[PDB]
Amino acid sequence: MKKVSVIMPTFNNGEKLHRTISSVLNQTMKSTDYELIIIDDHSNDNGETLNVIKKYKGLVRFKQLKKNSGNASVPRNTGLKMSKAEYVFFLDSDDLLHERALEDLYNYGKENNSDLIIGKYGVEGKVPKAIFEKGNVAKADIIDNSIFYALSVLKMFKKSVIDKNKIKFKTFSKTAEDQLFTIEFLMNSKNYSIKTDYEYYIVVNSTGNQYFATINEIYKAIYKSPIYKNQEKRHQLAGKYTTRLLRHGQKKNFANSKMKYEDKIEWLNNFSKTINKVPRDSDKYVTQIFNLKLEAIRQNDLLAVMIADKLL
Amino acid sequence: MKKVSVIMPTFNNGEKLHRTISSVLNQTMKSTDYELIIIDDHSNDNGETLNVIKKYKGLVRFKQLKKNSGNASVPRNTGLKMSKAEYVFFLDSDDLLHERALEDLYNYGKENNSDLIIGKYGVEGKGRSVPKAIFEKGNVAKADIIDNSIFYALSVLKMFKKSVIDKNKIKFKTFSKTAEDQLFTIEFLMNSKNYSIKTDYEYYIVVTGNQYFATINEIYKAIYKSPIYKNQEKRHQLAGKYTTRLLRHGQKKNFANSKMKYEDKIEWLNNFSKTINKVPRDSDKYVTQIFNLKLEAIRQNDLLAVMIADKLL
Amino acid sequence: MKKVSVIMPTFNNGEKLHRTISSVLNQTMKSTDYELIIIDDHSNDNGETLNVIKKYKGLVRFKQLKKNSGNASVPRNTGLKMSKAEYVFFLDSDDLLHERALEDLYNYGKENNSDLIIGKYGVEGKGSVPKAIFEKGNVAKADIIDNSIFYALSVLKMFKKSVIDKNKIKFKTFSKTAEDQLFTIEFLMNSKNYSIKTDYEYYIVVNDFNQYFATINEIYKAIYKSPIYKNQEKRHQLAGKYTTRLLRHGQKKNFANSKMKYEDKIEWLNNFSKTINKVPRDSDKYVTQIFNLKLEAIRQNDLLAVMIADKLL
Numbered sequence: 001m002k003k004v005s006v007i008m009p010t011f012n013n014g015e016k017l018h019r020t021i022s023s024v025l026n027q028t029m030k031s032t033d034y035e036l037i038i039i040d041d042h043s044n045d046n047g048e049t050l051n052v053i054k055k056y057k058g059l060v061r062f063k064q065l066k067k068n069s070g071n072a073s074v075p076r077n078t079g080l081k082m083s084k085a086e087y088v089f090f091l092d093s094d095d096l097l098h099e100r101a102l103e104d105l106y107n108y109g110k111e112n113n114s115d116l117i118i119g120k121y122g123v124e125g126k127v128p129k130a131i132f133e134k135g136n137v138a139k140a141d142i143i144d145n146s147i148f149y150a151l152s153v154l155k156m157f158k159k160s161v162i163d164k165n166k167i168k169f170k171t172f173s174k175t176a177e178d179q180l181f182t183i184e185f186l187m188n189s190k191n192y193s194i195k196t197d198y199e200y201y202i203v204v205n206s207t208g209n210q211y212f213a214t215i216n217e218i219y220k221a222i223y224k225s226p227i228y229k230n231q232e233k234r235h236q237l238a239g240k241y242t243t244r245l246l247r248h249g250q251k252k253n254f255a256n257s258k259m260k261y262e263d264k265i266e267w268l269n270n271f272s273k274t275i276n277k278v279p280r281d282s283d284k285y286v287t288q289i290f291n292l293k294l295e296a297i298r299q300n301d302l303l304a305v306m307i308a309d310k311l312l
Numbered sequence: 313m314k315k316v317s318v319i320m321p322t323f324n325n326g327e328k329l330h331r332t333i334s335s336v337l338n339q340t341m342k343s344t345d346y347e348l349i350i351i352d353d354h355s356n357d358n359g360e361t362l363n364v365i366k367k368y369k370g371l372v373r374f375k376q377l378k379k380n381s382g383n384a385s386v387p388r389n390t391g392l393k394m395s396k397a398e399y400v401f402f403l404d405s406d407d408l409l410h411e412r413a414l415e416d417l418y419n420y421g422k423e424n425n426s427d428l429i430i431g432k433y434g435v436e437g438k439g440r441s442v443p444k445a446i447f448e449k450g451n452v453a454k455a456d457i458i459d460n461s462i463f464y465a466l467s468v469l470k471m472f473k474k475s476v477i478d479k480n481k482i483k484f485k486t487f488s489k490t491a492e493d494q495l496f497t498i499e500f501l502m503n504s505k506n507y508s509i510k511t512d513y514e515y516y517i518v519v520t521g522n523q524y525f526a527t528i529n530e531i532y533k534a535i536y537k538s539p540i541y542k543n544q545e546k547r548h549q550l551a552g553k554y555t556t557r558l559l560r561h562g563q564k565k566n567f568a569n570s571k572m573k574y575e576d577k578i579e580w581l582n583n584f585s586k587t588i589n590k591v592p593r594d595s596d597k598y599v600t601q602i603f604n605l606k607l608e609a610i611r612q613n614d615l616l617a618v619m620i621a622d623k624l625l
Numbered sequence: 626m627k628k629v630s631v632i633m634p635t636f637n638n639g640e641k642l643h644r645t646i647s648s649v650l651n652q653t654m655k656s657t658d659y660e661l662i663i664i665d666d667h668s669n670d671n672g673e674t675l676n677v678i679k680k681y682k683g684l685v686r687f688k689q690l691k692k693n694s695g696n697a698s699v700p701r702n703t704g705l706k707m708s709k710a711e712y713v714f715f716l717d718s719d720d721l722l723h724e725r726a727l728e729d730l731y732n733y734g735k736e737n738n739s740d741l742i743i744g745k746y747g748v749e750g751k752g753s754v755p756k757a758i759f760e761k762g763n764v765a766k767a768d769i770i771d772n773s774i775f776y777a778l779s780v781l782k783m784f785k786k787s788v789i790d791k792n793k794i795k796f797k798t799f800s801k802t803a804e805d806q807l808f809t810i811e812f813l814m815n816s817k818n819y820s821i822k823t824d825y826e827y828y829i830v831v832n833d834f835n836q837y838f839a840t841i842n843e844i845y846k847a848i849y850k851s852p853i854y855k856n857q858e859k860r861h862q863l864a865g866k867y868t869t870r871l872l873r874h875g876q877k878k879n880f881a882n883s884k885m886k887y888e889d890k891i892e893w894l895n896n897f898s899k900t901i902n903k904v905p906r907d908s909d910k911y912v913t914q915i916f917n918l919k920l921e922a923i924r925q926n927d928l929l930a931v932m933i934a935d936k937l938l
């Protein structure tokens with residue numbers, strides 16, 4: 001059993017993919033203990049991506065899907081089925097791992113019996129920060145360590161948790177599926193760790209029917225948590241997630257935007273129906289400045305949302 | 313016939329009463345000219361309150377009700393029936409009278425043929441009078457509800473002419489605990505016209521919404537049926553000035569953005585809205601303009617608009 | 626065939642009218658090339674306006690309406706029926722022409738094949754005229770949006786008469802205001818060539834001592850049926866730029882927080898709402914962004930939101 005499967009979907013990456021693959025093959029961890037699983041989502045760049053990948057034959061595992069899925073969910077699920085490692089780590093094909101990433105995160109996880117290890121993110125070009133503000137955290141808390149503000153899957157996940165709970169990337173929506181994966185993982189596991197000694201992971205830079213179906217699933221995951229079983233704790237998590245959704249949600253400022261009227265109505269209708277399945281008991285945990293915006297959304301009142309945004 | 317009846321309801325006050333009763337017996341007014349009437353609302357403090365009252369036998373009048381009524385209304389109504397004086401003055405069981413209070417207010421009322429005399433007063437602790445506009449112009453022989461800010465001083469710590477109460481059958485209501493005192497003063501004001509304000513001393517020292525809005529509804533009814541203020545536009549002006557006072561000082565005035573449960577907010581606003589919508593809109597132009605949005609939002613029964621109105625205030 | 630008919634309605638103008646008539650008779654244009662048509666709206670100032678007009682008999686054409694109509698629309702239409710000239714120019718009886726107005730405007734118009742010629746306005750005494758239309762100097766081929774014509778829609782302009790005749794353009798009596806705006810819009814929507822001349826103050830406005838939305842509706846209808854501006858996106862652009870003009874300078878633009886009676890105010894909003902809701906939402910992208918909330922609030926027919934929108938501007 002390997003310590004870590006790095007799962008990396010590709011699509012039309014081309015020559016830039018050398019630096020990514022190279023960052024993974026040059027880990028401090030012994031290559032006996034990890035594998036890179038590359039799942040190409042049927043690239044169509046006259047062979048250029050597949051040609052880069054072929055230079056690493058024998059050093060990687062590779063699968064190409066027959067038809068392009070059009071998002072990382074199907075390739076990520078494929079990678080999950082192929083991995084038999086203790087932990088998985090999702091890498092986006094533009095990005096880079098620090099040479100110490102797999103070894104440092106695995107070791108910290110092993111030491112602290114971690115279900116999830118989050119490595120500090122860096123950037124190339126012009127990522128969450130609050131989660132990393134306290135340095136290393138051996139046993140982090142969702143609310144105190146701002147985990148709802150860092151829900152990417154660019155993290156080290158314990159595979160047994162995924163297997164036992166049959167956690168998979170959903171395909172019904174094109175967006176927020178990663179967030180849902182991470183939420184379902186958090187709600188079905190206990191021990192999360194945050195590791196900060198280096199920048200371990202370097203990021204290289206709709207009507208809402210699908211998106212709000214996915215948000216609906218996030219709230220469902222919280223309220224059915226077998227880890228957080230207390231109803232008041234579920235209200236608290238749900239309320240803190242609402243706060244995050246209002247601060248950083250997709251199209252958060254739709255109301256006063258240049259969106260067509262009928263689109264704004266359909267968006268808000270979806271947002272309203274979703275939030276009205278969330279108990280009002282969660283509302284007291286939402287930050288006070290958002291009181292009017294949240295109520296506007298509950299009432300499905302576009303003018304009130306517009307006004308709420310003007311006053312924020 | 314006595315000049316003044318002081319009417320004081322009691323319930324479970326015990327030894328605290330001593331200070332109050334002493335302050336009433338130590339008046340400059342000749343003791344033959346006034347009476348303290350104590351009405352006990354069936355205290356159940358192991359005889360402590362009634363024991364205190366009985367140590368003043370022969371110096372006060374009293375009666376204990378058979379059942380506890382719940383608020384000051386039925387005891388005060390009972391004091392009203394027992395009084396044959398020319399003026400009544402309501403004093404609560406923890407209040408203090410200045411020694412010159414009855415004489416100074418009575419004499420000023422008598423000089424000015426007053427239906428109502430209002431003395432300057434303050435609150436325990438403060439050592440000074442309340443900062444109300446009503447007392448900021450000094451002695452006023454013939455006051456005006458609007459010019460002398462009387463809607464901001466609707467307590468029943470006033471000296472009221474008894475014939476006004478008897479002829480118009482004015483009684484305290486048991487609709488709600490809150491605002492029963494306001495309603496009585498409003499009914500009295502709408503049935504009289506000679507109001508005096510005396511300010512030489514701190515004359516006394518004081519300590520769903522379905523029922524509350526029922527009381528507010530009776531206030532507007534009192535104004536719009538006034539047999540003194542009969543002109544329709546004057547009624548609109550009085551109603552509008554009362555609306556202003558309600559928005560400035562009413563109960564749970566900032567409920568909309570408060571931590572109250574949503575269901576409670578809706579219930580509260582619905583009662584408020586049903587009540588205000590019985591008030592003619594002709595009154596609204598007399599409300600201070602900063603409240604124009606909040607008032608319309610209440611008439612429209614629109615919680616989001618009240619929330620917004622409050623954020624802009 | 627005259628070059629120009631000046632059409633001037635009168636009513637109880639009296640002695641003042643000498644100076645206006647004199648300004649028309651004193652033109653650089655040859656006197657035989659133009660005519661002044663005076664239509665008196667049955668003045669009743671004891672023969673005085675008539676007496677002034679009669680002093681110019683033989684130098685003007687004159688018709689007295691047999692009963693007063695109370696507006697400039699019926700006299701102006703009367704004037705149009707009487708004119709057989711190439712161009713007409715409407716003159717208000719308070720106002721004055723520069724001696725070079727008819728010649729300079731007509732010559733510019735001829736040079737540039739103009740349907741409409743607009744000369745710079747001056748103003749006498751406090752009580753202003755549009756400016757933006759005149760801040761690009763002399764414009765041979767002007768554009769409604771780029772030359773701010775929506776901000777200068779009076780009929781104190783030179784209009785080619787064939788355009789009016791073949792399209793049967795007439796002044797309406799829907800409203801007290803904006804009937805001149807509707808006339809100019811209907812003309813603009815039936816013509817392509819407009820000119821602006823700014824070398825002099827050609828026209829001096831002298832400051833001496835009821836279905837508005839029916840009119841606004843007819844303005845949007847004229848845009849959306851224009852045989853000149855046939856492209857649907859262009860119509861949307863014109864409609865949005867007009868909407869912007871309406872929100873910046875319209876009648877009672879701040880009605881929502883005004884002291885208008887509720888019944889009048891709610892009528893105003895509803896008539897505004899139902900008028901704008903006949904205008905495609907495609908036009909709203911051409912409205913200045915600051916008005917986004919106010920415009921949507923009107924479309925939604927929501928008085929509270931319009932009140933709030935005005936408070937935020």
Ligand SMILES: [Cl-]
Pocket residue numbers: 142143144146147148240241
């Ligand atoms: Cl949080």
Ligand SMILES: [Cl-]
Pocket residue numbers: 148149150151244248
């Ligand atoms: Cl976030």
Ligand SMILES: [Cl-]
Pocket residue numbers: 128149150151152153154
């Ligand atoms: Cl993240």
Ligand SMILES: [Cl-]
Pocket residue numbers: 227228229230
């Ligand atoms: Cl638990």
Ligand SMILES: [Cl-]
Pocket residue numbers: 176245248249250
């Ligand atoms: Cl989101």
Ligand SMILES: [Cl-]
Pocket residue numbers: 457458461462463553554
């Ligand atoms: Cl007042």
Ligand SMILES: [Cl-]
Pocket residue numbers: 464465466467468
């Ligand atoms: Cl008071």
Ligand SMILES: [Cl-]
Pocket residue numbers: 488520521522523524525
């Ligand atoms: Cl109540």
Ligand SMILES: [Cl-]
Pocket residue numbers: 768769770771
């Ligand atoms: Cl244009």
Ligand SMILES: [Cl-]
Pocket residue numbers: 755776777778779780
């Ligand atoms: Cl103009």
Ligand SMILES: [Mg+2]
Pocket residue numbers: 301303304614616617929
């Ligand atoms: Mg609203």
Ligand SMILES: [Mg+2]
Pocket residue numbers: 650651652653654655656
């Ligand atoms: Mg001449």
